[PDB]
Design an enzyme around this catalytic site. Structure first.
Site, mmCIF file in Angstrom:
data_model
loop_
_atom_site.group_PDB
_atom_site.id
_atom_site.type_symbol
_atom_site.label_atom_id
_atom_site.label_comp_id
_atom_site.label_asym_id
_atom_site.label_seq_id
_atom_site.Cartn_x
_atom_site.Cartn_y
_atom_site.Cartn_z
ATOM 1 N N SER A 170 -4.545 -0.586 -4.057
ATOM 2 C CA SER A 170 -3.203 -0.875 -4.568
ATOM 3 C C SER A 170 -2.890 -2.361 -4.394
ATOM 4 O O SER A 170 -2.945 -2.888 -3.273
ATOM 5 C CB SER A 170 -2.134 -0.057 -3.825
ATOM 6 O OG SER A 170 -2.251 1.357 -4.015
ATOM 7 N N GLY A 171 -2.541 -3.032 -5.488
ATOM 8 C CA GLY A 171 -2.291 -4.465 -5.487
ATOM 9 C C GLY A 171 -3.495 -5.386 -5.681
ATOM 10 O O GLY A 171 -3.328 -6.605 -5.647
ATOM 11 N N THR A 175 -4.535 -3.581 -13.057
ATOM 12 C CA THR A 175 -3.653 -3.598 -14.236
ATOM 13 C C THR A 175 -3.622 -4.966 -14.923
ATOM 14 O O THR A 175 -3.671 -5.037 -16.149
ATOM 15 C CB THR A 175 -2.230 -3.112 -13.845
ATOM 16 O OG1 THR A 175 -2.271 -1.708 -13.527
ATOM 17 C CG2 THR A 175 -1.221 -3.231 -15.009
ATOM 18 N N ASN A 216 2.809 -3.414 -3.787
ATOM 19 C CA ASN A 216 2.800 -4.062 -5.105
ATOM 20 C C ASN A 216 4.194 -3.987 -5.771
ATOM 21 O O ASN A 216 4.738 -2.901 -5.926
ATOM 22 C CB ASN A 216 1.715 -3.371 -5.962
ATOM 23 C CG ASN A 216 1.496 -4.013 -7.340
ATOM 24 O OD1 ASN A 216 2.192 -4.942 -7.749
ATOM 25 N ND2 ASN A 216 0.488 -3.495 -8.067
ATOM 26 N N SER A 219 3.651 -1.748 -9.049
ATOM 27 C CA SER A 219 2.650 -0.703 -8.857
ATOM 28 C C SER A 219 2.651 0.338 -9.985
ATOM 29 O O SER A 219 3.706 0.861 -10.375
ATOM 30 C CB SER A 219 2.868 0.012 -7.523
ATOM 31 O OG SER A 219 1.793 0.888 -7.226
ATOM 32 N N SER A 220 1.459 0.632 -10.502
ATOM 33 C CA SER A 220 1.261 1.746 -11.438
ATOM 34 C C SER A 220 1.390 3.088 -10.704
ATOM 35 O O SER A 220 0.634 3.334 -9.752
ATOM 36 C CB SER A 220 -0.133 1.649 -12.073
ATOM 37 O OG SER A 220 -0.398 0.351 -12.589
ATOM 38 N N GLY A 440 -7.391 3.573 -7.199
ATOM 39 C CA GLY A 440 -8.648 3.417 -6.478
ATOM 40 C C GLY A 440 -8.791 4.361 -5.289
ATOM 41 O O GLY A 440 -7.839 5.039 -4.929
ATOM 42 N N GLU A 442 -8.537 5.268 -1.681
ATOM 43 C CA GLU A 442 -7.674 4.723 -0.621
ATOM 44 C C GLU A 442 -7.377 5.754 0.466
ATOM 45 O O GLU A 442 -7.360 6.961 0.200
ATOM 46 C CB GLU A 442 -6.358 4.188 -1.198
ATOM 47 C CG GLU A 442 -6.508 3.031 -2.170
ATOM 48 C CD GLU A 442 -5.178 2.420 -2.588
ATOM 49 O OE1 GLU A 442 -4.726 1.465 -1.908
ATOM 50 O OE2 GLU A 442 -4.587 2.893 -3.590
HETATM 51 N N1 LIG Z 1 -5.671 -12.631 -12.062
HETATM 52 C C1 LIG Z 1 -4.358 -12.743 -11.577
HETATM 53 N N2 LIG Z 1 -3.654 -13.875 -11.724
HETATM 54 C C2 LIG Z 1 -2.387 -13.989 -11.255
HETATM 55 N N3 LIG Z 1 -1.759 -12.971 -10.625
HETATM 56 C C3 LIG Z 1 -2.434 -11.825 -10.480
HETATM 57 C C4 LIG Z 1 -3.713 -11.695 -10.951
HETATM 58 N N4 LIG Z 1 -4.211 -10.419 -10.665
HETATM 59 C C5 LIG Z 1 -3.241 -9.734 -9.847
HETATM 60 N N5 LIG Z 1 -2.050 -10.596 -9.919
HETATM 61 C C6 LIG Z 1 -0.911 -10.485 -8.989
HETATM 62 O O1 LIG Z 1 -1.010 -9.304 -8.189
HETATM 63 C C7 LIG Z 1 -0.050 -8.316 -8.591
HETATM 64 C C8 LIG Z 1 -0.673 -6.931 -8.496
HETATM 65 O O2 LIG Z 1 -1.721 -6.800 -9.452
HETATM 66 P P1 LIG Z 1 -1.936 -5.403 -10.247
HETATM 67 O O3 LIG Z 1 -2.982 -5.714 -11.379
HETATM 68 O O4 LIG Z 1 -0.515 -4.817 -10.676
HETATM 69 O O5 LIG Z 1 -2.618 -4.445 -9.090
HETATM 70 P P2 LIG Z 1 -3.196 -2.920 -9.238
HETATM 71 O O6 LIG Z 1 -2.963 -2.554 -10.743
HETATM 72 O O7 LIG Z 1 -4.675 -3.083 -8.766
HETATM 73 O O8 LIG Z 1 -2.234 -2.186 -8.232
HETATM 74 C C9 LIG Z 1 0.391 -8.740 -9.984
HETATM 75 O O9 LIG Z 1 1.675 -8.218 -10.338
HETATM 76 C C10 LIG Z 1 0.328 -10.248 -9.850
HETATM 77 O O10 LIG Z 1 1.512 -10.740 -9.221
HETATM 78 F F1 BEF Z 2 -2.749 0.401 -7.853
HETATM 79 BE BE1 BEF Z 2 -1.697 -0.502 -8.377
HETATM 80 F F2 BEF Z 2 -0.540 -0.550 -7.449
HETATM 81 F F3 BEF Z 2 -1.285 -0.236 -9.781
HETATM 82 MG MG LIG Z 3 -1.781 -0.998 -11.571
#
Ligand SMILES: Nc1ncnc2c1ncn2[C@@H]1O[C@H](COP(=O)(O)OP(=O)(O)O)[C@@H](O)[C@H]1O
Ligand code: BEF
Ligand SMILES: [Mg+2]
Length: 702
Positions: A170-171, A175, A216, A219-220, A440, A442
């Site tokens: 997460s984070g 996405t 996050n 967060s999705s 993922g 976790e």
């Molecule tokens: N390549 C990147 N460049 C800039 N910021 C990023 C990048 N990748 C992640 N982020 C930062 O991290 C945050 C969380 O990423 P996210 O893709 O929503 O995580 P996940 O989908 O794995 O939970 C984003 O909202 C952004 O602020």
């Molecule tokens: F897993 Be992430 F918070 F979308």
């Molecule tokens: Mg996400």
């Protein structure tokens, strides 16, 4: 040409800058195994080295325990397959040297590794997109755009469908990297009206499906598989979206510092004066479903501005003005339902003293308030042969109200996805590239039914990777007649998978189903049954020493302990029939579809009743895996640098923990077994038809 011009932004932001004795990694303190410094070897025996520490003292280490340091010319290499030594500090060292230079992407064999920067890096402009067009992987720097282009060219050259599987905690960046793949494909393969509609689907689904958590800000709270469809000429012709595991529980409860779904705050902040009075709205502080966590806003985010973006996206995809008003009536109605206050009457049964919230919900939903009141507090239930109204107490009335809310929100989300697919999707595509962005693997302080479904999903996805790697190696050895043997590590996952989803012997989900569809079961009868079948009997299961509500599963990435509370209710997902009848009579054109269209209102039929939630998910995952097995896959492993959402802070334990359990360390080492280095004749052994094979280390000595 930017790739040869050393003054370009490409060279500045994506390359290590180009101009015109023996060492090891050791722990100064043995109680901190992930903190390393460099030492110089000064002598040796047959089985040990003596080295100097940073302060100039002598220490000894066994040769089999030593972490040798790679030659310094390799510090910053773009693919870690080039390193002589692949021990833990050596792999972390190369990733850190690159991160220090804001180089977030690195290859490790088949993997693209992506470390979240937590700041903006200017590598995603249209000018950057254009550089990656038609370039091979070893012709350009590591980038999410590079693997996207390689997938697109493989589709056009091999005439084969492709997939990109993007994972991490997460984070970590799943996405954001998914958005960049879709951006890249829309540019290189696009015209247009359709392309804009595909891109604008994203803000709609994020408004209703994402929320602020402790890990996050965006967060999705659902998973997605996006299929981008192409004609035979390679142009975009359509798209389709599948959604998975929406967290319906968030609508009615949020932990300290978290928020509900973004859309609730967008509506209250962005609605007009007329909209506000028509919907009976006020501020978020006046609604139970938004006023308990202590957080109603996100730093750097304007909810009123985001509402404009959501409505513009709805206009572009093609939701009518009446459809949009009905969607917001449902969101408003849910908030009003949460404000209904059940209190104890003269006896044990609940009453409703103030009718204001009930009447407001009823007005916007278009239902009869007297009928809704009786459906919540005096539902007719089948007891023996008699259909009889039963007067519920405060607890049960409130739980039933919460069930109505979660059903309304879950069904609305399904309807939104279906309406989007009606606009975007084609009956006749020639090829597709699919992108998977799902939760993922976790481990949390509490892991329940939803987390078992997530970790089960990732067990299957890791098996898929290992089997792919096996097939690639098998193909090359048998295409060279080199008669060397090795095992498919995909087989090693099957015991855990069977423990979860097996039929005979029955696994965890099968036993849950048996307890769910017949009477007299509780959460205690359920956990007892699991222990009876698996404790000291299946090598991947553990009954706890003391806890009476938990059990353990040994996954590829370690043991996880799960709790059983409420699993029977989760598997049935019940809603009183009198509530279904109330809303079936709605005067609203959208609400009527949520309760009268069987594709939305009901799960699939099974026996004389319906399939359970666990059986539905097993089938959904099996369908996804079947689709993936028809594609050529590509793998992205996202890594979070720390747990504080901060830039320039790559923490050794946080990162090495992920490397030990995300498959990166295990994978890069597996390809060193046998004969890793292969090179054509023109350009410890076993002779082939066209190449020279060589065991680890030999080529480096030469
Ligand atoms: N390549 C990147 N460049 C800039 N910021 C990023 C990048 N990748 C992640 N982020 C930062 O991290 C945050 C969380 O990423 P996210 O893709 O929503 O995580 P996940 O989908 O794995 O939970 C984003 O909202 C952004 O602020
Ligand atoms: F897993 Be992430 F918070 F979308
Ligand atoms: Mg996400």
């Amino acid at each position: 040409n930017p790739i040869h011009d050393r003054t370009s932004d490409y060279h500045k932001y994506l390359k290590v800058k180009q101009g015109d004795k023996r060492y090891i990694w050791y722990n100064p303190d043995p109680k901190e195994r992930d903190s390393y410094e460099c030492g110089e070897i000064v002598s040796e025996t047959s089985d040990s080295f003596t080295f100097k520490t940073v302060d100039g003292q002598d220490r000894q280490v066994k040769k089999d325990d030593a972490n040798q340091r790679n030659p310094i010319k390799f510090d910053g290499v773009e693919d870690m397959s080039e390193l002589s030594y692949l021990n833990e500090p050596a792999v972390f060292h190369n990733l850190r040297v690159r991160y220090n230079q804001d180089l977030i992407y690195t290859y490790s064999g088949l993997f693209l590794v992506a470390v979240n920067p937590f700041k903006r890096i200017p590598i995603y402009t249209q000018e950057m997109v254009d550089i990656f067009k038609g370039r091979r992987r070893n012709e350009v720097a590591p980038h999410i755009f590079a693997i996207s282009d390689v997938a697109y060219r493989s589709m056009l050259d091999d005439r084969q469908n492709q997939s990109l599987l993007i994972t991490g905690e997460s984070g970590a960046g799943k996405t954001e990297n998914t958005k960049k793949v879709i951006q890249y494909l829309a540019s290189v393969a696009g015209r247009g009206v359709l392309e804009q509609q595909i891109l604008q689907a994203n803000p709609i689904l994020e408004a209703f499906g994402n929320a602020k958590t402790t890990r996050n800000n965006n967060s999705s709270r659902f998973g997605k598989f996006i299929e981008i469809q192409f004609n035979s000429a390679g142009f975009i012709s359509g798209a389709s979206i599948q959604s998975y595991l929406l967290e319906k529980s968030r609508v009615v409860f949020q932990s300290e510092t978290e928020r509900n779904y973004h859309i609730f705050y967008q509506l209250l902040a962005g609605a007009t004066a007329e909209e506000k009075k028509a919907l009976h709205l006020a501020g978020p502080e006046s609604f139970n479903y938004l006023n308990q966590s202590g957080c109603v806003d996100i730093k750097g985010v304007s909810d009123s501005e985001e509402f404009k973006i959501t409505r513009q996206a709805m206009d572009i995809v093609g939701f009518s003005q009446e459809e949009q008003m009905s969607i917001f009536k449902i969101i408003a109605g849910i908030l009003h339902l949460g404000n209904i206050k059940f209190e104890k009457g003269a006896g044990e049964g609940a009453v409703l003293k103030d009718k204001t919230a009930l009447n407001a919900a009823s007005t916007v939903f278009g239902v009869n308030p007297s009928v809704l009141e009786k459906a919540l507090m005096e539902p007719r239930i089948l007891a023996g042969r008699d259909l009889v109204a039963q007067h519920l107490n405060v607890e049960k009335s409130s739980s039933s109200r919460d069930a109505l809310v979660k059903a309304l929100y879950g069904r609305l989300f399904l309807w939104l996805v279906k309406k989007i697919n009606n606009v975007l999707c084609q009956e006749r595509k020639a090829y597709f590239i699919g992108v998977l962005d799902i939760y993922g693997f976790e481990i949390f302080k509490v892991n329940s039914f939803e987390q078992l479904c997530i970790n089960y999903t990732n067990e299957k996805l890791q098996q898929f990777f290992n089997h792919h790697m096996f097939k690639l190696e098998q193909e090359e050895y048998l295409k060279e007649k080199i008669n060397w043997t090795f095992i498919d590590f995909g087989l090693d996952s099957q015991a855990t998978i069977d423990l979860i989803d097996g039929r005979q012997p029955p696994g965890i989900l099968a036993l849950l189903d048996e307890q769910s569809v017949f009477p007299n079961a509780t959460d205690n009868t359920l956990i007892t049954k699991l222990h009876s079948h698996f404790s000291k009997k299946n090598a991947k299961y553990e009954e706890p020493r003391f806890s009476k509500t938990e059990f353990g599963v040994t996954h590829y990435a370690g043991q996880v302990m799960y709790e059983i509370q409420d699993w029977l209710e989760k598997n049935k997902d019940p809603l009183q029939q009198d509530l279904e009848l109330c809303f079936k009579d709605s005067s609203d054109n959208v609400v009527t579809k949520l309760f009268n269209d069987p594709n939305i209102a009901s799960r699939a039929k099974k026996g004389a009743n319906f399939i359970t939630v666990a059986a539905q998910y097993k089938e959904q995952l099996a369908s996804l895996m079947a689709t993936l097995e028809t594609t050529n896959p590509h793998f992205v492993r996202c890594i979070i640098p720390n747990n504080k959402q901060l830039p320039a802070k790559l923490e050794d334990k946080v990162v090495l923990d992920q490397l030990r359990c995300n498959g990166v360390l295990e994978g890069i080492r597996i390809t060193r077994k046998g004969f890793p280095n292969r090179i054509i004749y023109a350009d410890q052994f076993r002779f082939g038809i066209t190449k020279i094979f060589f065991r680890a280390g030999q080529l480096a000595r030469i």
